[PDB]
Amino acid sequence: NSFSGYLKLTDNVYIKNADIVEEAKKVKPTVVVNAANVYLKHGGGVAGALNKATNNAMQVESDDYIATNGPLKVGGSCVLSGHNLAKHCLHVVGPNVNKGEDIQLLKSAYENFNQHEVLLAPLLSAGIFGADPIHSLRVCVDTVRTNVYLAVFDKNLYDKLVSSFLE
Numbered sequence: 199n200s201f202s203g204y205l206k207l208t209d210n211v212y213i214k215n216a217d218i219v220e221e222a223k224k225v226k227p228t229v230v231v232n233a234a235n236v237y238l239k240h241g242g243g244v245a246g247a248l249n250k251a252t253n254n255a256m257q258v259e260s261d262d263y264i265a266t267n268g269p270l271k272v273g274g275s276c277v278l279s280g281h282n283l284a285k286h287c288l289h290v291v292g293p294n295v296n297k298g299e300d301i302q303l304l305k306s307a308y309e310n311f312n313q314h315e316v317l318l319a320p321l322l323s324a325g326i327f328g329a330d331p332i333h334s335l336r337v338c339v340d341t342v343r344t345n346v347y348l349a350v351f352d353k354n355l356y357d358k359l360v361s362s363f364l365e
């Protein structure tokens with residue numbers, strides 16, 4: 199859990215302008231969070247980048263999890279292997295508001311982080327899931343009580359997040 203160059207926002211939330219894949223390789227955290235969908239199909243975005251970095255091992259394991267257990271619910275999670283990126287991957291499903299899913303489930307999604315002492319995570323429901331990223335950071339700060347290191351791979355969004363939080 200050798201995190202470097204993060205800005206501490208609150209006693210338990212830290213943020214960095216960085217690609218979560220590059221962070222996982224440098225840090226080898228105990229837990230990396232994937233911004234998953236309910237069938238664990240890692241077709242693009244953050245999930246696609248994490249799966250590519252495992253040379254598709256994450257997708258094969260995920261398909262075998264879904265066959266045996268069925269899909270996740272929106273707001274839910276499962277713990278699978280971290281492969282070469284971490285000890286464990288916490289696959290968390292935030293709501294996709296661009297597909298009509300309820301934004302209130304973002305609180306449920308961040309509540310899954312509280313079962314793990316330290317996590318490397320992306321900003322849930324941001325990007326093409328359509329949530330307002332400043333709202334997602336506020337939900338994270340108000341909900342997560344364990345130690346979370348957010349990697350946001352966009353300097354423009356990183357700067358807007360830090361400015362809106364420190365105002």
Ligand SMILES: CC(C)[C@H](Nc1ncnc2[nH]cnc12)c1ccc2c(c1)S(=O)(=O)CCC2
Pocket residue numbers: 216217218219233242243244245247320321322323324325326327349350351352355
């Ligand atoms: C908002 C961007 C900058 C961020 N991308 C990334 N953030 C951190 N490490 C990365 N590596 C490659 N991409 C990123 C991000 C945050 C959450 C989500 C998405 C994208 S999405 O569009 O894949 C849909 C799932 C939710």
